[PDB]
């Protein structure tokens, strides 16, 4: 006998903020605080991470939560008219 396709629990995902030249530094610090509950002197250090490396992991959530967060961040960036890009990363 058998039992349909596989299972495997959903994977956790990394939420990432990509760097760009048009988004002002202050706005990214703002996003890190508003959507990641980051300490002022932690978000600020994390913005430096994004600028320096060109990309930085802002957190790790379930696939479900990560997807919602990415969408909240990008919608916000868009409404403020900044090309701030937030992305999803498996593992």
């Amino acid at each position: 006998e058998k039992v349909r396709d596989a299972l495997k629990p959903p994977s956790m995902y990394k939420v990432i903020l990509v760097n760009d030249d048009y988004t002002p530094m202050e706005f990214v610090i703002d996003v890190l605080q508003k959507f990641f509950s980051y300490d002022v002197e932690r978000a600020t250090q994390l913005m430096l991470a994004v600028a320096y490396q060109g990309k930085a992991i802002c957190g790790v959530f379930t696939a479900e939560v990560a997807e919602t967060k990415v969408a909240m961040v990008n919608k916000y960036a868009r409404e403020n008219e900044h090309p701030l890009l937030c992305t999803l990363e498996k593992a």
Partner: protein, 146 residues
């Protein structure tokens, strides 16, 4: 997306999220809530699912993985996940296209399966329940696994 019975479940799901100050209203809170929704509970009992085990599994998972608000913040009480919005739209679209005008907990239960990548869909499969099983119970008769 209304059924009184279903609306109650949705109310309980949100009240629970807000109680633990959860930042998000998950498909897992939804299924957790549906466990006491007669329509849903019924289809799951017909599928010989251990509700006690499922309930424990769901509660453990949402406490360990759901982000908690800063206790301060504005109030912005619980943001439904995109997955959550999708299962509801799916259940609503199915009912509307069937010519009926009532969305039951069981319809919602069915829509959850299409959310691959949700812990909820994973836990249902783990308990040997498939979309087809719920669909067979909903229609025809009590086509039960038992």
């Amino acid at each position: 997306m209304l059924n009184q019975e279903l609306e109650l479940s949705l109310n309980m799901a949100f009240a629970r999220a807000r109680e633990h100050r959860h930042e998000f209203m998950t498909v897992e809170h939804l299924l957790l809530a549906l466990l006491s929704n007669p329509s849903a509970r019924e289809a799951l009992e017909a599928c010989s699912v251990d509700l006690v085990a499922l309930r424990q599994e769901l509660e453990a998972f949402i406490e360990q993985t759901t982000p908690v608000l800063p206790a301060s913040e504005e109030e912005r009480d619980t943001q439904p996940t995109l997955s959550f919005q999708r299962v509801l739209q799916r259940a609503v679209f199915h009912v509307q296209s069937s010519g009926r005008n009532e969305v039951t907990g069981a319809n919602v239960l069915v829509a959850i399966f299409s959310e691959q990548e949700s812990q909820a869909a994973y836990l249902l499969r783990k308990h040997e329940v498939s979309r087809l099983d719920v669909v067979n119970f909903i229609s025809h008769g009590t086509r039960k696994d038992e």
